[PDB]
């Protein structure tokens, strides 16, 4: 049911959609 | 955590709802 590990970038695409124009901490590079 | 719940397993969205500053 739409359940898969979001690693690489898909996560950031879903991380900036739940926060908004504020920004989130997620750039382990 | 984000890579321990999204990369180690599946992440829905409520998990990333706490990482929003």
Instruction: Evaluate whether A17 touches B12 at the Cβ level (below 8 Å).
Output: no
Instruction: Evaluate whether B16 touches A23 at the Cβ level (below 8 Å).
Output: no
DSSP string, B1-21: --TTTTTSS---STTTTSSB-
Contacts of B19 in chain A (CB under 8 A): 15, 19, 24-26
Q: How was this structure determined?
A: NMR
User: Given B3, B8, B17, which is nearest A28 (Cβ)?
Assistant: B3
Question: How far is the first Cα of chain B from the last one, in angstroms, to the nearest whole number?
Answer: 14
d(CA B21, CA B18): 8
**What is the residue extent of each domain of chain A?**
1-29
Instruction: Show the tokens assigned to A20.
Output: 């908004």
SS3 A24: strand
């Amino acid at each position: 049911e739409v359940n898969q590990h979001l690693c690489g970038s898909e996560l950031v695409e879903a991380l900036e959609l739940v926060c908004g124009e504020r920004g989130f901490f997620y750039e382990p590079k | 955590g984000i890579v321990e719940q999204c990369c180690h397993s599946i992440c829905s969205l409520y998990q990333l709802e706490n990482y929003c500053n």
